[PDB]
Structures are given as structure tokens and as C-alpha cells.
Amino acid sequence: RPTFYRQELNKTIWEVPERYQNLSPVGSGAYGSVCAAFDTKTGHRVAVKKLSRPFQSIIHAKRTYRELRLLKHMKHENVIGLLDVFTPARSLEEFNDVYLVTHLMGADLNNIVQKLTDDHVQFLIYQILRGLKYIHSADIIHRDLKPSNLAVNEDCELKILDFGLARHTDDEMTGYVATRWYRAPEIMLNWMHYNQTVDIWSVGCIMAELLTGRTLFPGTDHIDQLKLILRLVGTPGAELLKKISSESARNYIQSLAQMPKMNFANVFIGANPLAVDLLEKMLVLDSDKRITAAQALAHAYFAQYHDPDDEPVADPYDQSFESRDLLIDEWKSLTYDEVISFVPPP
Ligand SMILES: NC(=O)NOCc1ccccc1
Ligand SMILES: [Cl-]
Ligand SMILES: [Cl-]
Ligand SMILES: [Cl-]
Ligand SMILES: [Cl-]
């Protein structure tokens, strides 16, 4: 066990191993607090998050376990990775606080989206799809891909962030808000059971915005956003209408006048024809028919970067716990086991 030291950072008591030095606050929220630090063992600048109230309810305790399970699994160049997890507790009986450590990320895709060449868009979207092939191979769905969740460094290298965090509230999804502009229509409106194809819709929205500099579907509310979507991709045919299980949602959609799919070459004026082709294969209303991440990596738009021998898949991820019912202290004991069993990366 390392030696820990204590200090108070903006009304919070932080107790961390000696290896972490020069702590300084970076952010706060309902989730907890974050500090930047220097890791003397590895030489990295790191971000350290102290969870707030990790075991205060069954829902909170299960969420803490979920976040730790997801972060411990992710071992890919284009996905956030866990550098360390620790607790000052010396036994399960005194276990209360959880600290998570990752690389310090500077800019997200907002902080750049600058003047992006088509070569920049190729490389950025290639890296998102390489990370998604990995995530999807483990049956993990992100559900919240947007520019603020994509970290980028000075060399244009990209990582996908935000796994296992608290679900977005109803009020966070209301009105003229980027928290909804990238969501697939079937999850925005609870049309049906969704699956991993929801993430490819988000990639299409991100790629369009990198090419134009403008939000693709900046709706002022759920219904305005759906109208913007159907104007571009067309109203649904009877094939897709069958698959909408909500009779109420089906009824509403049929109340709208029918519209054909627009010509994407006239929407994305001047863009690479191969980029236009890929956007048409991502932004398909029927999720059954969207291109997958593994398929999109092989599209000609990425010929400069595609290497099928360096696009790895994930180890299997057992998420049977998600359907399991447990008491607060049982979720907490499961979390404790995962803290003490952590093996740092090479
Ligand atoms: N869950 C997730 O995707 N990231 O949260 C882990 C984390 C965030 C900031 C600083 C240190 C660790
Ligand atoms: Cl130490
Ligand atoms: Cl503790
Ligand atoms: Cl965003
Ligand atoms: Cl597993």
C-alpha cells in the first residue's frame, strides 16, 4: 500500500498517494470534483476524479460499479483508458471514497471545430469509427457521442470519452441544447428498442458539422428537431412505420405531410463526393439499414488510413450485472473488489 497525504482543495478533502503531486482544481459538478496532477511514477500529467456520494442509494451504488467496470475494460488507442483507481480505506468496512485517474485531456472537438481540411475530417472521423468498432465489438453502446465527448491533442489524435456517467435528466434534454442535437431519432422519441446503430447516426451529425462548420440539426425542441431531420432524410415509408412500436409515435408521424429525401450533394456543396456518399449511408432513418462501424472503416473515403490489421476488437464484456438486483452494500462490496484487483497498464 502506498503512503497517502491529505489536503483541502476548494472545500474538498483529498487523500491521495504520494506519487500524485501539484494538485489543482479543474472542475466540479453533481458527479464530484476533478483535479489536474503530475504523476511522478509515469511522468504523465493526469486528471484525478473524486466521486461524490458514490454509495448513497442503490441507483448511485450500481452506477459507481458500472463506471468502474466500463473504465477497467477499455484498452484501445481511441478510447479513454484507466491509469489508476484507488481508495485510502484499508478495509471494506471503512470503504467510502473512490478516486479515478486518467490522462489529462486538453481540447475537445468543440475547442477546435479552426479551419478543417478534408484531410482533417478524414482522420478525425476515421479515429471515431476505429474506436466505435472496438466498443461495439464488446456490445457496449455509447448513446451520447457529441463533440464535447471527443478529446483531441495537437497531433489531431482523438479519444472517445464519457462511459457510465449519470443519465441525462429530462430538463437537460429540453429546448435549444447540444445535449440532444446529435441523438438518433429513435432514442430521442422512444420509437422502439434501440441498439448500437444509434452511435452511427451521431457520427454522421458530427462529420457534417466538421465539413460545414454548422450544427446539422439544431432543433429548438424535440419536435422542431424531428422536422429538421425528416426534411433532409425524408419521411418514413411503411416498412419503417411497422417497426415503431409506440402507436402514439406512429400516429404522430403519419400526421406529417410526406417529403422525399433531399439531394445531399446540394446540401453539402463543394464537399468530397466520397464524404457525401458516406453521409448518405450513415444518416439513414431506418436503423436496420445504416452502415456499421466495421463497414464504414472500409469505405473509400478512408483509403489513406484504413488498415484492417490495425483495427482491433475488444475482449468480451460481461454485463450480466445490469439485470441483477442487489442491496447497496452488495454493490459496494463488488466495487471494492474491483478497486483492489486493478492492474495498471504496462
Ligand atoms: N467515466 C468516464 O468516462 N470518465 O470519468 C473518469 C474520469 C474523469 C475525469 C478525471 C478522471 C477520471
Ligand atoms: Cl505513491
Ligand atoms: Cl475511504
Ligand atoms: Cl457538444
Ligand atoms: Cl467481463
Side-chain angles (χ1 to χ4, degrees), residues 1-5 7-8 12-30 32-40 42-44 46-52 54-58 60-92 94-112 116-142 144-153 155-166 168-192 194-241 243-246 248-303 305-346:
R1 182 179 177 274
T3 292
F4 290 70
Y5 74 105
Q7 87 194 266
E8 170 164 348
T12 322
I13 293 273
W14 289 64
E15 188 164 7
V16 312
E18 294 184 297
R19 69 186 273 190
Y20 300 111
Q21 294 288 318
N22 303 341
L23 273 61
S24 34
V26 159
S28 325
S33 310
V34 177
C35 285
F38 177 74
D39 181 11
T40 64
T42 67
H44 299 127
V46 296
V48 187
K49 175 168 65 173
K50 177 186 194 189
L51 296 186
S52 92
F55 309 110
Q56 60 166 146
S57 69
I58 294 180
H60 287 101
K62 183 176 183 186
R63 194 223 55 86
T64 296
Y65 179 74
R66 177 184 301 115
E67 179 175 5
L68 186 49
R69 285 290 313 277
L70 286 163
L71 288 177
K72 286 185 59 179
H73 196 81
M74 299 291 92
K75 307 205 174 174
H76 188 276
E77 302 179 339
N78 302 121
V79 185
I80 188 181
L82 190 62
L83 287 170
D84 199 15
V85 54
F86 60 82
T87 181
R90 309 169 113 102
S91 70
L92 174 63
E94 64 189 57
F95 175 50
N96 295 288
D97 287 321
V98 175
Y99 297 77
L100 304 166
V101 188
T102 193
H103 287 112
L104 189 57
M105 315 287 187
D108 62 34
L109 205 40
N110 284 321
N111 305 155
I112 304 125
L116 298 211
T117 72
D118 189 58
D119 293 294
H120 281 125
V121 185
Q122 285 177 34
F123 186 50
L124 286 166
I125 302 307
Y126 173 77
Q127 289 175 91
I128 302 174
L129 291 167
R130 190 172 174 260
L132 278 186
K133 179 195 183 192
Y134 172 90
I135 289 161
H136 287 176
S137 74
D139 283 325
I140 293 158
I141 306 175
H142 190 287
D144 199 28
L145 287 175
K146 57 192 164 170
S148 63
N149 282 162
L150 298 172
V152 180
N153 67 19
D155 289 350
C156 211
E157 308 181 317
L158 175 145
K159 282 177 188 277
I160 301 172
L161 317 168
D162 285 13
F163 291 90
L165 299 181
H168 283 278
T169 67
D170 273 352
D171 183 66
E172 280 165 341
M173 295 284 182
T174 300
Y176 188 72
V177 292
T179 55
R180 204 192 53 248
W181 293 338
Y182 306 86
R183 300 201 103 70
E186 67 268 18
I187 55 178
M188 183 172 80
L189 292 162
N190 279 74
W191 281 355
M192 66 193 68
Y194 65 91
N195 56 37
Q196 68 190 36
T197 60
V198 298
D199 289 334
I200 294 295
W201 183 273
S202 304
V203 179
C205 293
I206 291 161
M207 178 174 165
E209 181 170 344
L210 295 186
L211 292 169
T212 66
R214 308 293 162 194
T215 314
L216 180 59
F217 303 120
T220 62
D221 54 74
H222 292 65
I223 293 306
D224 182 64
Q225 190 173 324
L226 174 68
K227 287 173 178 173
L228 296 175
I229 289 170
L230 301 182
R231 182 176 179 253
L232 179 68
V233 306
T235 46
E239 213 181 321
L240 173 62
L241 279 161
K243 309 175 197 181
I244 307 193
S245 305
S246 188
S248 282
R250 262 199 329 266
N251 246 309
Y252 175 66
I253 295 198
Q254 283 163 15
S255 77
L256 302 172
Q258 295 187 68
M259 301 180 284
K261 175 186 158 307
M262 290 180 69
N263 184 324
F264 278 36
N266 291 328
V267 175
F268 304 104
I269 297 155
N272 185 333
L274 291 174
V276 174
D277 185 70
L278 182 56
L279 288 172
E280 291 186 319
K281 292 168 178 166
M282 295 176 160
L283 298 165
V284 180
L285 202 55
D286 188 341
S287 67
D288 287 344
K289 303 192 170 164
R290 280 170 211 156
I291 195 168
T292 71
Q295 288 152 15
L297 288 165
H299 191 278
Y301 187 56
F302 306 114
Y305 299 102
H306 177 46
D307 180 356
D309 288 328
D310 195 16
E311 288 160 1
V313 293
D315 288 337
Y317 172 69
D318 179 334
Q319 46 185 320
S320 62
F321 73 94
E322 290 288 6
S323 50
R324 196 176 304 145
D325 284 319
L326 299 175
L327 306 172
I328 280 185
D329 272 348
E330 300 178 314
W331 286 122
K332 184 166 154 175
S333 183
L334 286 177
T335 301
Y336 187 66
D337 289 342
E338 293 283 339
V339 174
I340 67 184
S341 64
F342 176 81
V343 175

